[PDB]
């Protein structure tokens, strides 16, 4: 129970962040995504005293007037909040509060050894619904704003200051060098306290096998089956799917005509490879929105089911020519599709349509 002088806080062995809970569309507000246990060395020089002394460890957040959802201070990443608490010797978890004054969260019996530890729990909390979360990785590097984390090691007469109360910091400087000044952490430093790695990012992508080909057989149809322009063959159903998707992945898919580069007068009509049938095209219908796909590069959202994302599709021949224009033959078309997470620029696959326009039934 000696007097503490010249306090300083120093980093211990730094732990990696751990996943308390998995982020999911099902994750509730207030859930703890990540947590880390931090241990700091508290060093001071003892000097003998007649009266018993205590080292009172205090904390408070300054630079913001009031706390955020779930006792958090806003993180640089929106919808994710930072909360830090001390694992007190009395066996109580106490969160450092947002207040103008520091609060007494722990005490340490003073000793000549001049060495002790301060123990904390770091927590990253979801303050919004997962859908509400921003696009991108979501890595947390810093607290938002000017908010600063203050740790106070303060020497006091044993038992004079109550735990859980505002921590009074004496006006006096004796004995010269008494422990009174704060340790203030700003921005990434508050997040990076105690050393160790930065929080991990959240994955937002599905697994894409590049060069994937899909073949759809439209079959053979006689010209007599398309009496009027805008008439179509029987629909063929197919699905374009992605698997091993991250919980919060929301990918999109875009299509281009393999044979046409310029913007089409009507991009709902996919072109046939030339030297075959004439006056016909292919139409593909989006199962979700119920509208025909445009093959100009418009991106389409995909449905999410379990770990996979898919777009349900159906395809058919459509008659575009007037009476003179129709010709029979091989009817083949191709659509290149790209996925954006958004993270794709290269073509990621092709859909091949094959079939025939025949004269005789």
Author numbering: 3 to 363
Give the article text.
Several clusters of these genes showed sequence similarity with the chaperone/usher (CU) pathway, which is conserved in Gram negative bacteria and involved in the assembly of extracellular fimbriae. One of these clusters, encoded by the cupB operon, is unique as it contains a non-chaperone-usher gene product, CupB5, which is related to the TpsA-like substrates of two-partner secretion (TPS) systems. The CupB4 chaperone was shown to be associated with the tip adhesin CupB6, which is larger than classical adhesive tip subunits and displays only limited sequence identity with other CU subunits. In this paper we describe the crystal structure of the tip adhesin CupB6.
The crystals belong to C2 space group and the asymmetric unit consists of eight molecules composed from two up-down-up-down tetramers. The molecular mass of CupB6dscB1 in solution was determined to be 39.5 kDa, which is consistent with a monomer. Each molecule consists of two domains comprising a putative tip adhesin (residues; 1–202) and the pilin domain (202–343). The pilin domain conforms to the classical Ig-like fold of other chaperone-usher pilin domains with a C-terminal β strand (strand G), provided by the NTE of CupB1 located at the C-terminus. Five alternating residues comprising glycine or large hydrophobic residues from the self-complementing G strand (G351, V353, F355, G357 and I359) are positioned to interact with the five pockets of the subunit groove. The adhesin domain of CupB6 is 205 amino acid residues in length and is significantly larger than typical adhesion domains of the chaperone-usher family, which are usually between 150 and 180 residues. One unique feature in the CupB6 structure is a surface-exposed polyproline helix (199PPPPPIP205) at the C-terminus of the adhesion domain. Adjacent to this is a shorter sequence (17LPWR19) that also adopts PPII helical secondary structure despite containing only one central proline. Adjacent to the PPII helix in CupB6 is a shallow pocket delineated by hydrophobic residues V21, L25, F36 and I204, which further suggests a role in receptor binding. The lack of a convincing binding pocket at the tip of the CupB6 adhesin domain would suggest it recognizes its receptor using an alternative surface.
